[PDB]
């Protein structure tokens, strides 16, 4: 129902969503945490709420009101997309047999045969994706909750939130998203080292310590 | 490099790209319903060319898949390059992860364990798409190389990618009368198992095909 391609088409919205998902937020500290004017920010929020992608509630807090994953492909041969509703995760297993799908069929109908065989494995991939994303969304809520209870630092969680979705970041990258200087980011990394396995490798690369975590 | 989100942001562009990937099959670039001035059509084609999606009679100049998520706790997207993907097998083990974690360290243990599974999923997806896209090209040549009817190919093309479509939906994007579409499906039936269910829903018989 909601037109997500249209919502994500604008780079300001994309940024607004990136922060509404990290936490807070409003309005104030929302148009603050991005480098475009507050009149445009006010505009985009109404568009998102109109579209049924945002909700507000009493200070006016905004929150995302949907849980959908999307998939699309664009090649010279094909263009398609499929929307996926998240939530009710049944943790199951998927076997994805891609060998030895006919790499060289010489005739039609047999080409239709394989493409279907491929579709059957793709339907599993889509299911798997739907499942993990339902899982990561629920678990993220718990990480967000546990963090605030165990230690109430919002920007420590924000960095952690960011590193969990995108595996790596520079202090530069992070500093931008947080609208606070590079130094004030480094000491937030130093502070969260007490609780979470974060580390500064190289000289500016902030990564989680995969080895220790698993 | 190409801002695909911006490109797909517009209904018309989206309808253009669904035709432009099968110009072998389609007679026009638009669905009959998306009634849009011929100067506006020209602009969208330029906007897409300005971005690096098209290249000239226009052709698609990228082969990408994306994936994105929007939930109250998450927003992320990831663009994948296609082409040469080696046919391997993937196991997605989710049985397999605990639903009641207690410790903050234990929750992060699970997230990275989910992240490791997602990497797999993403690799299967990229493999599948590379494979499918190739086979799609082959299917095209062959269809016009064996029974030679476009539009029948267009119907075949749309069903393979999207599972099902109503007669009305097909009639719309082919710019043909509904009787004509119904006719093309009849002629089509004796070459490939297409199936009308409830005399409005066009679908393939995956059972007869498998």
mmCIF file of C-alpha atoms in Angstrom:
data_model
loop_
_atom_site.group_PDB
_atom_site.id
_atom_site.type_symbol
_atom_site.label_atom_id
_atom_site.label_comp_id
_atom_site.label_asym_id
_atom_site.label_seq_id
_atom_site.Cartn_x
_atom_site.Cartn_y
_atom_site.Cartn_z
ATOM 1 C CA UNK A 1 0.000 0.000 0.000
ATOM 2 C CA UNK A 2 2.583 2.676 0.972
ATOM 3 C CA UNK A 3 4.822 3.719 -1.939
ATOM 4 C CA UNK A 4 8.303 3.042 -0.525
ATOM 5 C CA UNK A 5 10.209 3.640 -3.776
ATOM 6 C CA UNK A 6 8.705 7.150 -3.747
ATOM 7 C CA UNK A 7 9.660 7.723 -0.074
ATOM 8 C CA UNK A 8 13.237 6.467 -0.549
ATOM 9 C CA UNK A 9 13.608 8.451 -3.806
ATOM 10 C CA UNK A 10 14.477 11.585 -1.819
ATOM 11 C CA UNK A 11 17.908 11.664 -0.134
ATOM 12 C CA UNK A 12 16.681 13.870 2.735
ATOM 13 C CA UNK A 13 13.959 11.356 3.684
ATOM 14 C CA UNK A 14 16.534 8.543 3.475
ATOM 15 C CA UNK A 15 18.645 10.483 5.970
ATOM 16 C CA UNK A 16 15.645 11.332 8.182
ATOM 17 C CA UNK A 17 14.795 7.619 8.302
ATOM 18 C CA UNK A 18 18.404 6.665 9.086
ATOM 19 C CA UNK A 19 18.102 8.676 12.303
ATOM 20 C CA UNK A 20 14.503 7.859 13.267
ATOM 21 C CA UNK A 21 15.637 4.226 13.251
ATOM 22 C CA UNK A 22 18.755 4.891 15.385
ATOM 23 C CA UNK A 23 16.361 6.396 17.958
ATOM 24 C CA UNK A 24 15.027 9.611 19.606
ATOM 25 C CA UNK A 25 13.604 11.650 17.741
ATOM 26 C CA UNK A 26 12.326 15.220 17.013
ATOM 27 C CA UNK A 27 12.475 17.853 15.695
ATOM 28 C CA UNK A 28 14.608 20.022 16.653
ATOM 29 C CA UNK A 29 17.175 17.288 17.269
ATOM 30 C CA UNK A 30 15.946 15.776 13.982
ATOM 31 C CA UNK A 31 16.397 18.775 11.648
ATOM 32 C CA UNK A 32 19.452 19.416 13.820
ATOM 33 C CA UNK A 33 20.966 15.998 13.008
ATOM 34 C CA UNK A 34 20.845 16.698 9.246
ATOM 35 C CA UNK A 35 22.209 19.471 6.993
ATOM 36 C CA UNK A 36 19.037 20.744 5.274
ATOM 37 C CA UNK A 37 16.593 23.496 6.366
ATOM 38 C CA UNK A 38 13.808 22.939 8.923
ATOM 39 C CA UNK A 39 11.107 23.956 6.421
ATOM 40 C CA UNK A 40 12.100 21.075 4.099
ATOM 41 C CA UNK A 41 12.306 18.713 7.088
ATOM 42 C CA UNK A 42 8.779 19.759 8.083
ATOM 43 C CA UNK A 43 7.720 19.084 4.468
ATOM 44 C CA UNK A 44 9.167 15.544 4.221
ATOM 45 C CA UNK A 45 7.742 14.433 7.571
ATOM 46 C CA UNK A 46 4.207 15.338 6.454
ATOM 47 C CA UNK A 47 4.757 13.376 3.225
ATOM 48 C CA UNK A 48 5.949 10.331 5.190
ATOM 49 C CA UNK A 49 3.089 10.546 7.698
ATOM 50 C CA UNK A 50 0.583 11.118 4.874
ATOM 51 C CA UNK A 51 1.977 7.985 3.187
ATOM 52 C CA UNK A 52 1.530 5.966 6.415
ATOM 53 C CA UNK A 53 5.249 5.339 6.995
ATOM 54 C CA UNK A 54 5.601 7.652 10.005
ATOM 55 C CA UNK A 55 3.552 8.255 13.142
ATOM 56 C CA UNK A 56 3.730 11.049 15.717
ATOM 57 C CA UNK A 57 2.761 11.071 19.415
ATOM 58 C CA UNK A 58 2.967 13.242 22.550
ATOM 59 C CA UNK A 59 7.000 17.332 22.477
ATOM 60 C CA UNK A 60 6.150 15.627 19.179
ATOM 61 C CA UNK A 61 8.000 12.311 18.747
ATOM 62 C CA UNK A 62 8.112 10.637 15.319
ATOM 63 C CA UNK A 63 8.445 6.899 14.735
ATOM 64 C CA UNK A 64 8.369 4.523 11.762
ATOM 65 C CA UNK A 65 5.006 2.743 11.522
ATOM 66 C CA UNK A 66 5.773 -0.117 9.090
ATOM 67 C CA UNK A 67 7.990 -3.207 8.924
ATOM 68 C CA UNK A 68 8.730 -4.167 5.316
ATOM 69 C CA UNK A 69 11.720 -5.548 3.443
ATOM 70 C CA UNK A 70 12.088 -5.024 -0.308
ATOM 71 C CA UNK A 71 13.973 -6.659 -3.127
ATOM 72 C CA UNK A 72 14.500 -5.488 -6.702
ATOM 73 C CA UNK A 73 16.600 -6.369 -9.753
ATOM 74 C CA UNK A 74 17.529 -4.227 -12.744
ATOM 75 C CA UNK A 75 19.419 -5.787 -15.644
ATOM 76 C CA UNK A 76 19.119 -5.372 -19.403
ATOM 77 C CA UNK A 77 16.944 -8.520 -19.439
ATOM 78 C CA UNK A 78 14.681 -8.028 -16.399
ATOM 79 C CA UNK A 79 13.189 -5.553 -13.930
ATOM 80 C CA UNK A 80 11.110 -6.689 -10.951
ATOM 81 C CA UNK A 81 10.481 -5.943 -7.304
ATOM 82 C CA UNK A 82 8.786 -7.749 -4.421
ATOM 83 C CA UNK A 83 7.675 -6.267 -1.085
ATOM 84 C CA UNK A 84 7.978 -8.393 2.054
ATOM 85 C CA UNK A 85 6.059 -7.835 5.302
ATOM 86 C CA UNK A 86 8.156 -8.537 8.401
ATOM 87 C CA UNK A 87 7.241 -9.580 11.960
ATOM 88 C CA UNK A 88 6.114 -13.176 12.481
ATOM 89 C CA UNK A 89 9.496 -14.926 12.261
ATOM 90 C CA UNK A 90 9.497 -18.713 12.214
ATOM 91 C CA UNK A 91 13.180 -19.550 12.633
ATOM 92 C CA UNK A 92 13.628 -22.379 10.121
ATOM 93 C CA UNK A 93 16.337 -23.647 7.750
ATOM 94 C CA UNK A 94 16.730 -23.206 4.011
ATOM 95 C CA UNK A 95 18.777 -25.276 1.596
ATOM 96 C CA UNK A 96 19.597 -23.377 -1.609
ATOM 97 C CA UNK A 97 20.431 -25.827 -4.415
ATOM 98 C CA UNK A 98 21.997 -23.743 -7.192
ATOM 99 C CA UNK A 99 24.267 -26.509 -8.438
ATOM 100 C CA UNK A 100 23.955 -27.833 -10.925
ATOM 101 C CA UNK A 101 21.213 -25.756 -12.539
ATOM 102 C CA UNK A 102 21.553 -26.075 -16.305
ATOM 103 C CA UNK A 103 24.156 -23.493 -17.308
ATOM 104 C CA UNK A 104 23.772 -24.601 -20.944
ATOM 105 C CA UNK A 105 20.291 -25.684 -22.092
ATOM 106 C CA UNK A 106 20.097 -25.545 -25.897
ATOM 107 C CA UNK A 107 16.297 -25.348 -26.267
ATOM 108 C CA UNK A 108 13.171 -23.577 -24.959
ATOM 109 C CA UNK A 109 10.726 -25.148 -22.447
ATOM 110 C CA UNK A 110 13.869 -26.661 -20.912
ATOM 111 C CA UNK A 111 14.942 -23.049 -20.453
ATOM 112 C CA UNK A 112 11.528 -22.433 -18.929
ATOM 113 C CA UNK A 113 12.169 -25.522 -16.776
ATOM 114 C CA UNK A 114 15.389 -24.172 -15.246
ATOM 115 C CA UNK A 115 14.056 -20.655 -14.770
ATOM 116 C CA UNK A 116 11.268 -22.162 -12.661
ATOM 117 C CA UNK A 117 13.793 -24.316 -10.777
ATOM 118 C CA UNK A 118 15.628 -21.021 -10.140
ATOM 119 C CA UNK A 119 12.418 -19.309 -9.024
ATOM 120 C CA UNK A 120 11.821 -22.091 -6.484
ATOM 121 C CA UNK A 121 15.240 -21.461 -4.929
ATOM 122 C CA UNK A 122 14.666 -17.683 -5.100
ATOM 123 C CA UNK A 123 11.375 -18.063 -3.206
ATOM 124 C CA UNK A 124 13.433 -19.661 -0.413
ATOM 125 C CA UNK A 125 16.002 -16.842 -0.444
ATOM 126 C CA UNK A 126 13.151 -14.361 -0.135
ATOM 127 C CA UNK A 127 11.754 -16.384 2.766
ATOM 128 C CA UNK A 128 15.153 -16.559 4.459
ATOM 129 C CA UNK A 129 15.578 -12.803 4.000
ATOM 130 C CA UNK A 130 12.084 -12.154 5.401
ATOM 131 C CA UNK A 131 12.969 -14.388 8.383
ATOM 132 C CA UNK A 132 16.371 -12.875 9.300
ATOM 133 C CA UNK A 133 15.038 -9.338 8.984
ATOM 134 C CA UNK A 134 12.088 -10.128 11.249
ATOM 135 C CA UNK A 135 14.702 -11.480 13.667
ATOM 136 C CA UNK A 136 17.167 -8.583 13.445
ATOM 137 C CA UNK A 137 14.358 -6.059 13.940
ATOM 138 C CA UNK A 138 13.112 -7.736 17.142
ATOM 139 C CA UNK A 139 16.632 -8.290 18.475
ATOM 140 C CA UNK A 140 17.543 -4.664 17.702
ATOM 141 C CA UNK A 141 14.645 -3.516 19.917
ATOM 142 C CA UNK A 142 16.150 -5.615 22.732
ATOM 143 C CA UNK A 143 19.676 -4.273 22.131
ATOM 144 C CA UNK A 144 18.161 -0.764 22.187
ATOM 145 C CA UNK A 145 16.317 -1.569 25.431
ATOM 146 C CA UNK A 146 19.129 -3.475 27.172
ATOM 147 C CA UNK A 147 21.588 -0.709 26.309
ATOM 148 C CA UNK A 148 19.461 2.047 27.872
ATOM 149 C CA UNK A 149 18.801 -0.011 31.022
ATOM 150 C CA UNK A 150 22.398 -1.239 31.430
ATOM 151 C CA UNK A 151 23.900 2.188 30.462
ATOM 152 C CA UNK A 152 21.919 5.228 29.285
ATOM 153 C CA UNK A 153 24.323 6.637 26.666
ATOM 154 C CA UNK A 154 22.379 7.421 23.502
ATOM 155 C CA UNK A 155 25.335 8.178 21.196
ATOM 156 C CA UNK A 156 27.152 5.017 22.329
ATOM 157 C CA UNK A 157 24.060 3.070 21.218
ATOM 158 C CA UNK A 158 23.804 5.078 17.974
ATOM 159 C CA UNK A 159 27.363 4.075 17.004
ATOM 160 C CA UNK A 160 26.563 0.500 18.018
ATOM 161 C CA UNK A 161 23.290 0.673 16.056
ATOM 162 C CA UNK A 162 25.263 1.870 13.021
ATOM 163 C CA UNK A 163 28.083 -0.702 13.251
ATOM 164 C CA UNK A 164 25.524 -3.517 13.499
ATOM 165 C CA UNK A 165 23.752 -2.686 10.211
ATOM 166 C CA UNK A 166 26.834 -1.578 8.261
ATOM 167 C CA UNK A 167 29.869 -3.595 9.372
ATOM 168 C CA UNK A 168 32.460 -0.810 9.240
ATOM 169 C CA UNK A 169 32.796 2.965 9.496
ATOM 170 C CA UNK A 170 35.390 5.710 9.694
ATOM 171 C CA UNK A 171 35.290 8.237 12.517
ATOM 172 C CA UNK A 172 34.587 10.645 9.634
ATOM 173 C CA UNK A 173 31.471 8.729 8.502
ATOM 174 C CA UNK A 174 30.141 8.389 12.057
ATOM 175 C CA UNK A 175 30.955 11.987 13.047
ATOM 176 C CA UNK A 176 28.775 13.238 10.166
ATOM 177 C CA UNK A 177 25.769 11.061 11.111
ATOM 178 C CA UNK A 178 26.080 12.171 14.757
ATOM 179 C CA UNK A 179 26.653 15.894 14.015
ATOM 180 C CA UNK A 180 29.352 15.899 16.721
ATOM 181 C CA UNK A 181 33.123 16.325 16.178
ATOM 182 C CA UNK A 182 35.601 13.465 15.528
ATOM 183 C CA UNK A 183 37.173 13.717 19.013
ATOM 184 C CA UNK A 184 33.778 13.429 20.749
ATOM 185 C CA UNK A 185 33.223 10.262 18.679
ATOM 186 C CA UNK A 186 36.574 8.651 19.590
ATOM 187 C CA UNK A 187 35.933 8.994 23.332
ATOM 188 C CA UNK A 188 32.435 7.554 22.860
ATOM 189 C CA UNK A 189 34.178 4.587 21.234
ATOM 190 C CA UNK A 190 36.586 4.473 24.203
ATOM 191 C CA UNK A 191 33.673 4.616 26.681
ATOM 192 C CA UNK A 192 31.669 1.817 25.017
ATOM 193 C CA UNK A 193 34.745 -0.445 24.999
ATOM 194 C CA UNK A 194 33.900 -1.247 28.643
ATOM 195 C CA UNK A 195 30.641 -2.950 27.603
ATOM 196 C CA UNK A 196 30.783 -3.866 23.881
ATOM 197 C CA UNK A 197 33.637 -5.327 21.728
ATOM 198 C CA UNK A 198 34.229 -2.167 19.629
ATOM 199 C CA UNK A 199 37.752 -1.299 18.398
ATOM 200 C CA UNK A 200 39.640 1.277 16.344
ATOM 201 C CA UNK A 201 41.739 -0.709 13.859
ATOM 202 C CA UNK A 202 44.064 1.017 11.378
ATOM 203 C CA UNK A 203 43.947 4.661 12.500
ATOM 204 C CA UNK A 204 40.332 5.618 11.735
ATOM 205 C CA UNK A 205 38.422 2.378 10.992
ATOM 206 C CA UNK A 206 35.793 1.572 13.624
ATOM 207 C CA UNK A 207 34.777 -2.087 13.588
ATOM 208 C CA UNK A 208 33.195 -4.665 15.884
ATOM 209 C CA UNK A 209 35.384 -7.526 17.084
ATOM 210 C CA UNK A 210 33.748 -10.389 15.145
ATOM 211 C CA UNK A 211 36.187 -12.963 16.584
ATOM 212 C CA UNK A 212 35.364 -12.269 20.255
ATOM 213 C CA UNK A 213 31.605 -11.833 19.647
ATOM 214 C CA UNK A 214 31.218 -15.301 18.076
ATOM 215 C CA UNK B 1 27.291 5.448 -8.362
ATOM 216 C CA UNK B 2 23.804 5.352 -9.959
ATOM 217 C CA UNK B 3 21.158 6.594 -7.493
ATOM 218 C CA UNK B 4 18.649 3.813 -8.203
ATOM 219 C CA UNK B 5 16.367 4.935 -5.353
ATOM 220 C CA UNK B 6 15.908 8.272 -7.096
ATOM 221 C CA UNK B 7 15.360 6.481 -10.451
ATOM 222 C CA UNK B 8 12.718 4.053 -9.172
ATOM 223 C CA UNK B 9 11.125 6.892 -7.161
ATOM 224 C CA UNK B 10 8.839 7.713 -10.086
ATOM 225 C CA UNK B 11 5.910 5.515 -11.250
ATOM 226 C CA UNK B 12 6.468 6.392 -14.935
ATOM 227 C CA UNK B 13 10.201 5.603 -14.857
ATOM 228 C CA UNK B 14 9.273 2.362 -13.112
ATOM 229 C CA UNK B 15 6.846 1.551 -15.920
ATOM 230 C CA UNK B 16 9.433 2.532 -18.536
ATOM 231 C CA UNK B 17 12.069 0.159 -17.097
ATOM 232 C CA UNK B 18 9.610 -2.759 -17.054
ATOM 233 C CA UNK B 19 9.119 -2.291 -20.804
ATOM 234 C CA UNK B 20 12.734 -1.325 -21.634
ATOM 235 C CA UNK B 21 14.031 -4.687 -20.383
ATOM 236 C CA UNK B 22 11.916 -6.486 -22.994
ATOM 237 C CA UNK B 23 11.848 -4.315 -26.129
ATOM 238 C CA UNK B 24 12.019 -7.573 -28.085
ATOM 239 C CA UNK B 25 8.554 -8.292 -26.661
ATOM 240 C CA UNK B 26 6.874 -4.894 -26.139
ATOM 241 C CA UNK B 27 5.544 -2.649 -28.909
ATOM 242 C CA UNK B 28 5.502 0.486 -26.730
ATOM 243 C CA UNK B 29 7.287 1.739 -23.597
ATOM 244 C CA UNK B 30 4.243 2.530 -21.431
ATOM 245 C CA UNK B 31 1.102 0.963 -19.985
ATOM 246 C CA UNK B 32 -2.083 2.420 -21.506
ATOM 247 C CA UNK B 33 -3.271 3.716 -18.097
ATOM 248 C CA UNK B 34 -0.114 5.760 -17.368
ATOM 249 C CA UNK B 35 -1.328 8.418 -19.841
ATOM 250 C CA UNK B 36 1.683 10.757 -19.945
ATOM 251 C CA UNK B 37 2.640 13.473 -22.478
ATOM 252 C CA UNK B 38 5.307 12.501 -25.040
ATOM 253 C CA UNK B 39 7.510 15.398 -23.875
ATOM 254 C CA UNK B 40 7.412 14.101 -20.292
ATOM 255 C CA UNK B 41 8.333 10.573 -21.438
ATOM 256 C CA UNK B 42 11.328 12.143 -23.207
ATOM 257 C CA UNK B 43 12.421 13.837 -19.963
ATOM 258 C CA UNK B 44 12.358 10.662 -17.830
ATOM 259 C CA UNK B 45 14.494 8.927 -20.458
ATOM 260 C CA UNK B 46 16.991 11.774 -20.181
ATOM 261 C CA UNK B 47 16.935 11.758 -16.355
ATOM 262 C CA UNK B 48 17.738 8.040 -16.435
ATOM 263 C CA UNK B 49 20.468 8.598 -19.035
ATOM 264 C CA UNK B 50 21.915 11.463 -16.963
ATOM 265 C CA UNK B 51 22.317 8.937 -14.110
ATOM 266 C CA UNK B 52 23.932 5.951 -15.883
ATOM 267 C CA UNK B 53 21.026 3.510 -16.053
ATOM 268 C CA UNK B 54 20.306 3.802 -19.795
ATOM 269 C CA UNK B 55 22.407 3.905 -22.996
ATOM 270 C CA UNK B 56 21.396 4.061 -26.678
ATOM 271 C CA UNK B 57 16.324 3.031 -29.000
ATOM 272 C CA UNK B 58 17.457 2.848 -25.364
ATOM 273 C CA UNK B 59 19.235 0.008 -23.520
ATOM 274 C CA UNK B 60 19.881 -0.609 -19.806
ATOM 275 C CA UNK B 61 23.536 0.068 -18.917
ATOM 276 C CA UNK B 62 23.658 -1.632 -15.471
ATOM 277 C CA UNK B 63 23.069 -5.070 -13.943
ATOM 278 C CA UNK B 64 22.278 -4.600 -10.248
ATOM 279 C CA UNK B 65 20.134 -5.999 -7.459
ATOM 280 C CA UNK B 66 19.213 -4.116 -4.309
ATOM 281 C CA UNK B 67 17.791 -5.125 -0.950
ATOM 282 C CA UNK B 68 16.340 -2.832 1.712
ATOM 283 C CA UNK B 69 14.544 -2.822 5.040
ATOM 284 C CA UNK B 70 12.324 -0.329 6.818
ATOM 285 C CA UNK B 71 11.197 -1.224 10.353
ATOM 286 C CA UNK B 72 10.895 0.972 13.481
ATOM 287 C CA UNK B 73 14.308 -0.358 14.633
ATOM 288 C CA UNK B 74 16.088 -0.567 11.241
ATOM 289 C CA UNK B 75 16.834 1.132 7.937
ATOM 290 C CA UNK B 76 19.475 -0.225 5.601
ATOM 291 C CA UNK B 77 19.983 -0.951 1.901
ATOM 292 C CA UNK B 78 22.655 -2.821 -0.059
ATOM 293 C CA UNK B 79 23.415 -2.739 -3.779
ATOM 294 C CA UNK B 80 24.836 -5.865 -5.398
ATOM 295 C CA UNK B 81 26.718 -6.188 -8.703
ATOM 296 C CA UNK B 82 25.764 -9.137 -10.886
ATOM 297 C CA UNK B 83 27.322 -10.983 -13.862
ATOM 298 C CA UNK B 84 29.808 -13.766 -13.093
ATOM 299 C CA UNK B 85 28.383 -15.693 -10.133
ATOM 300 C CA UNK B 86 29.631 -19.233 -9.518
ATOM 301 C CA UNK B 87 26.858 -21.772 -8.905
ATOM 302 C CA UNK B 88 27.457 -22.860 -5.310
ATOM 303 C CA UNK B 89 25.091 -24.146 -2.620
ATOM 304 C CA UNK B 90 23.983 -22.142 0.391
ATOM 305 C CA UNK B 91 22.762 -23.245 3.807
ATOM 306 C CA UNK B 92 20.822 -20.688 5.836
ATOM 307 C CA UNK B 93 20.871 -21.961 9.414
ATOM 308 C CA UNK B 94 18.462 -20.042 11.639
ATOM 309 C CA UNK B 95 17.094 -22.901 13.769
ATOM 310 C CA UNK B 96 19.496 -22.044 15.320
ATOM 311 C CA UNK B 97 19.548 -18.739 17.181
ATOM 312 C CA UNK B 98 17.966 -18.138 20.591
ATOM 313 C CA UNK B 99 14.761 -16.091 20.999
ATOM 314 C CA UNK B 100 15.275 -15.297 24.700
ATOM 315 C CA UNK B 101 18.724 -13.732 25.181
ATOM 316 C CA UNK B 102 19.534 -12.283 28.613
ATOM 317 C CA UNK B 103 22.907 -10.503 28.391
ATOM 318 C CA UNK B 104 23.816 -7.519 26.178
ATOM 319 C CA UNK B 105 26.930 -9.433 25.023
ATOM 320 C CA UNK B 106 24.665 -12.404 24.223
ATOM 321 C CA UNK B 107 22.361 -10.211 22.079
ATOM 322 C CA UNK B 108 25.283 -8.913 19.995
ATOM 323 C CA UNK B 109 26.502 -12.516 19.657
ATOM 324 C CA UNK B 110 23.151 -13.272 18.004
ATOM 325 C CA UNK B 111 23.090 -10.180 15.758
ATOM 326 C CA UNK B 112 26.496 -10.923 14.203
ATOM 327 C CA UNK B 113 25.347 -14.549 13.862
ATOM 328 C CA UNK B 114 22.301 -13.236 11.991
ATOM 329 C CA UNK B 115 24.569 -10.904 9.991
ATOM 330 C CA UNK B 116 26.645 -13.927 8.935
ATOM 331 C CA UNK B 117 23.486 -15.644 7.647
ATOM 332 C CA UNK B 118 22.408 -12.514 5.782
ATOM 333 C CA UNK B 119 25.748 -12.488 3.919
ATOM 334 C CA UNK B 120 24.913 -16.002 2.712
ATOM 335 C CA UNK B 121 21.369 -14.952 1.693
ATOM 336 C CA UNK B 122 22.786 -11.961 -0.175
ATOM 337 C CA UNK B 123 25.201 -14.231 -2.049
ATOM 338 C CA UNK B 124 22.477 -16.695 -2.993
ATOM 339 C CA UNK B 125 20.339 -13.801 -4.216
ATOM 340 C CA UNK B 126 23.167 -12.356 -6.381
ATOM 341 C CA UNK B 127 23.876 -15.828 -7.760
ATOM 342 C CA UNK B 128 20.165 -16.452 -8.529
ATOM 343 C CA UNK B 129 19.797 -13.085 -10.289
ATOM 344 C CA UNK B 130 22.937 -13.428 -12.385
ATOM 345 C CA UNK B 131 21.733 -16.881 -13.435
ATOM 346 C CA UNK B 132 18.141 -15.746 -14.067
ATOM 347 C CA UNK B 133 19.158 -12.677 -16.092
ATOM 348 C CA UNK B 134 21.402 -14.745 -18.385
ATOM 349 C CA UNK B 135 18.730 -17.401 -18.886
ATOM 350 C CA UNK B 136 16.193 -14.640 -19.579
ATOM 351 C CA UNK B 137 18.250 -13.419 -22.568
ATOM 352 C CA UNK B 138 18.516 -17.003 -23.847
ATOM 353 C CA UNK B 139 14.750 -17.492 -23.465
ATOM 354 C CA UNK B 140 14.175 -14.333 -25.543
ATOM 355 C CA UNK B 141 16.289 -15.272 -28.595
ATOM 356 C CA UNK B 142 14.869 -18.792 -28.488
ATOM 357 C CA UNK B 143 11.210 -17.716 -28.289
ATOM 358 C CA UNK B 144 11.601 -15.474 -31.354
ATOM 359 C CA UNK B 145 13.778 -18.231 -32.887
ATOM 360 C CA UNK B 146 11.160 -21.024 -32.630
ATOM 361 C CA UNK B 147 7.624 -19.576 -32.748
ATOM 362 C CA UNK B 148 8.422 -15.909 -33.444
ATOM 363 C CA UNK B 149 5.503 -14.206 -31.646
ATOM 364 C CA UNK B 150 6.466 -11.214 -29.540
ATOM 365 C CA UNK B 151 3.801 -10.183 -26.961
ATOM 366 C CA UNK B 152 3.387 -13.929 -26.314
ATOM 367 C CA UNK B 153 6.994 -13.592 -25.250
ATOM 368 C CA UNK B 154 5.979 -10.452 -23.323
ATOM 369 C CA UNK B 155 3.331 -12.411 -21.470
ATOM 370 C CA UNK B 156 5.889 -15.168 -20.780
ATOM 371 C CA UNK B 157 8.432 -12.590 -19.676
ATOM 372 C CA UNK B 158 6.083 -10.942 -17.157
ATOM 373 C CA UNK B 159 4.813 -14.205 -15.617
ATOM 374 C CA UNK B 160 8.314 -15.645 -15.079
ATOM 375 C CA UNK B 161 9.339 -12.517 -13.177
ATOM 376 C CA UNK B 162 6.039 -11.859 -11.312
ATOM 377 C CA UNK B 163 4.185 -15.186 -10.876
ATOM 378 C CA UNK B 164 0.712 -13.991 -11.934
ATOM 379 C CA UNK B 165 -1.242 -11.195 -13.679
ATOM 380 C CA UNK B 166 -4.878 -10.478 -14.492
ATOM 381 C CA UNK B 167 -6.041 -10.327 -18.134
ATOM 382 C CA UNK B 168 -6.853 -6.659 -17.411
ATOM 383 C CA UNK B 169 -3.274 -6.066 -16.145
ATOM 384 C CA UNK B 170 -1.729 -7.679 -19.250
ATOM 385 C CA UNK B 171 -4.100 -5.809 -21.574
ATOM 386 C CA UNK B 172 -3.019 -2.598 -19.883
ATOM 387 C CA UNK B 173 0.756 -2.979 -20.296
ATOM 388 C CA UNK B 174 0.589 -4.510 -23.793
ATOM 389 C CA UNK B 175 -1.767 -1.752 -25.022
ATOM 390 C CA UNK B 176 -3.975 -4.514 -26.462
ATOM 391 C CA UNK B 177 -7.708 -5.241 -26.149
ATOM 392 C CA UNK B 178 -8.626 -7.939 -23.614
ATOM 393 C CA UNK B 179 -9.973 -10.274 -26.333
ATOM 394 C CA UNK B 180 -6.608 -9.988 -28.101
ATOM 395 C CA UNK B 181 -4.746 -10.915 -24.894
ATOM 396 C CA UNK B 182 -7.120 -13.853 -24.393
ATOM 397 C CA UNK B 183 -6.407 -14.905 -27.979
ATOM 398 C CA UNK B 184 -2.610 -14.691 -27.523
ATOM 399 C CA UNK B 185 -2.850 -16.873 -24.381
ATOM 400 C CA UNK B 186 -4.775 -19.534 -26.362
ATOM 401 C CA UNK B 187 -2.153 -19.666 -29.143
ATOM 402 C CA UNK B 188 0.491 -19.613 -26.414
ATOM 403 C CA UNK B 189 -0.979 -22.573 -24.486
ATOM 404 C CA UNK B 190 0.102 -25.234 -27.032
ATOM 405 C CA UNK B 191 3.756 -24.108 -26.740
ATOM 406 C CA UNK B 192 4.100 -23.349 -23.005
ATOM 407 C CA UNK B 193 1.742 -24.304 -20.105
ATOM 408 C CA UNK B 194 0.068 -20.969 -19.385
ATOM 409 C CA UNK B 195 -3.188 -21.285 -17.422
ATOM 410 C CA UNK B 196 -6.183 -19.011 -16.857
ATOM 411 C CA UNK B 197 -7.719 -19.365 -13.396
ATOM 412 C CA UNK B 198 -11.159 -17.874 -12.634
ATOM 413 C CA UNK B 199 -11.264 -16.453 -16.202
ATOM 414 C CA UNK B 200 -9.248 -13.359 -15.197
ATOM 415 C CA UNK B 201 -5.978 -14.540 -13.574
ATOM 416 C CA UNK B 202 -3.148 -15.599 -15.889
ATOM 417 C CA UNK B 203 -0.592 -17.929 -14.319
ATOM 418 C CA UNK B 204 1.985 -20.575 -15.308
ATOM 419 C CA UNK B 205 1.646 -24.222 -14.343
ATOM 420 C CA UNK B 206 4.878 -24.769 -12.418
ATOM 421 C CA UNK B 207 3.887 -28.431 -11.871
ATOM 422 C CA UNK B 208 3.590 -29.279 -15.587
ATOM 423 C CA UNK B 209 6.818 -27.315 -16.181
ATOM 424 C CA UNK B 210 8.595 -29.248 -13.395
#
